[PDB]
Structures are given as C-alpha cells and as structure tokens.
Paper text:
The formation of autophagosomes requires the hierarchical action of a number of conserved factors, including the upstream-acting ULK1 complex containing the scaffold protein FIP200 and the downstream-acting conjugation machinery, which catalyzes the conjugation of the ubiquitin-like ATG8 proteins to the head group of phosphatidylethanolamine on the isolation membrane. The interaction of p62 with FIP200 is mediated by a positively charged pocket in the Claw, enhanced by p62 phosphorylation, mutually exclusive with the binding of p62 to LC3B, and it promotes degradation of ubiquitinated cargo by autophagy.
To gain mechanistic insights into the FIP200-p62 interaction, we determined the X-ray structure of the FIP200 CTR (aa 1458–1594). Crystals of this construct diffracted to a resolution of 3.2 Å and the phase problem was solved by a single anomalous dispersion approach using selenomethione-substituted crystals. A monomer of the FIP200 CTR comprises an N-terminal extended helix of 29 amino acids and a C-terminal globular domain of 100 amino acids to which we refer as the “Claw”. The connecting linker between the helix and the Claw is resolved in two out of six monomers. Accordingly, the Claw shows some flexibility relative to the helix. The linkers cross each other in such a way that the Claw of one monomer sits on top of the coiled-coil helix of the second monomer. Dimerization buries an extensive surface area of 1,440 Å2, suggesting a physiologically plausible assembly.
Numbering used by the authors:
A (entry chain B): 1455 to 1488, 1494 to 1542, 1550 to 1593
B (entry chain A): 1455 to 1489, 1494 to 1542, 1551 to 1593
Write the structure that this text describes.
Amino acid sequence: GAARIMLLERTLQLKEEENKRLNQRLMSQSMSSVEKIAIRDFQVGDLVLIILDERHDNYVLFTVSPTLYFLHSESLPALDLKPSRRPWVLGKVMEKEYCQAKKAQNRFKVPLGTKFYRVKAVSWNKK
Amino acid sequence: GAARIMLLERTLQLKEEENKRLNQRLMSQSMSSVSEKIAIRDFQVGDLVLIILDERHDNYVLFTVSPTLYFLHSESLPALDLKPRRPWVLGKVMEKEYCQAKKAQNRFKVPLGTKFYRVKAVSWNKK
C-alpha cells in the first residue's frame, strides 16, 4: 500500500514535469514558426533562373541536375520573351508537369524516350 | 488508504489526459507546419554562389544580375579545381574585398576607375 502511494506520487510528479516540458515546447514551436534562387528540388513559388538553351531550342530552368526542366510555350510570351533573343531572365515557378518525348523528332531536341519536366512560370520582380 | 490510492489514480489519469491532449495539439501544429539556395544579388559571407567563366574579362565571376562585378580571387581559383577549364561550378563565399581599377591596363579588363569586388570562395560539396 505504502509502495503504491509512493509510486503513484512519483509517477504523478513525472507526469507533471512532462506537462511543463510539453507546454513549454508548444510555446517555443509557436514562437519559432516565423531573394535566393532554388537550384535542386523545384517547388511552386520557388525563384528560378530561366536561361536560353540552343542545343535544345528552348529555354530551360537552371538546374545542376541531369533532369531537364523546360519552359512552357504559353509561359514564354507572358514575360516579354520573343518566340536571336535574350540570354536569361528570372522567374517564379508556378506549376510543373512530368513529360516524356514520345517521338524521336521533337522540338526539345532530346533523344527518344527522354523524360523531363515542363514548367509554367511567371516573372518575378524585386519587392 | 484505498481512497487515497484511487484519488491519486484519478489525478494521474487527469494529468496524463492533459499531457496527451497537448501532444495531439503538438502533432496537429507540426502537421499544419510547412513541409539549398544560391545568392544572386548582395553577397555576404557564407552564401552559395555560382562561379561561371566570363569571356570579356579574363576571369571567373559570381553570377550576378546586378551592375556591380564580383570577380573570383586569383589565389582562390586553383583551390576549387579551376585552372587559371570547367565552364561553371558553385561554391561558398568566404571573403569579399571592395577594389577599384587604378590602371587602364588592368587584368580584369575593366575601364579605368571601375569599382568592383574580389571574392575568395571555396568549393561546395553536397552531402
């Protein structure tokens, strides 16, 4: 009986310490929740550098990766890009689509069966 | 002391329920929570930059879409396996110095009186 009461008081103190620790952790996590370009894993809202590729006749997002990210045909004219012309521009990625070259003679100048991304992006100016 | 033991069991049960509710709140907060980068404009020490070869000026330059020119340091060049012929590589900036072209026959091929930066940076390897 005495052992049960002592154990219950000890575990109750342990639970109280846990309650203080968890409440303080919650307050700290709520406290800590609050111009650079993305290079690798592309997500919507990321800042990217669109450069002109000539080997493939298109504009491609700067990528330090084997996968090729091309710019979408509808996204080209929106940022005053003419269908030679400008070497690079800065933008913000809005949507990405996984595509594959089903035809050997394509506009992307990629070999047959190559999988790549097509990105719809909009220009991004400083704020 | 059965009454005392039961009182302690109830109080312990209440405290553990409070702790579990706080833990569920923490998990909900963590789930509501969201989920490298290159510096292009104003470089400060420790930023990841993209060193590319410039052809007009016989040097490697940090990519900048800004009027000021950031050159790579002559001594830092061989450290990141660039010989004074990779096209580009990315590194981490370690120190910058504000300089001005005092002679018309300078190595940077900048006009007389041009102000620029010289940055010593080190290669960057991803884990």
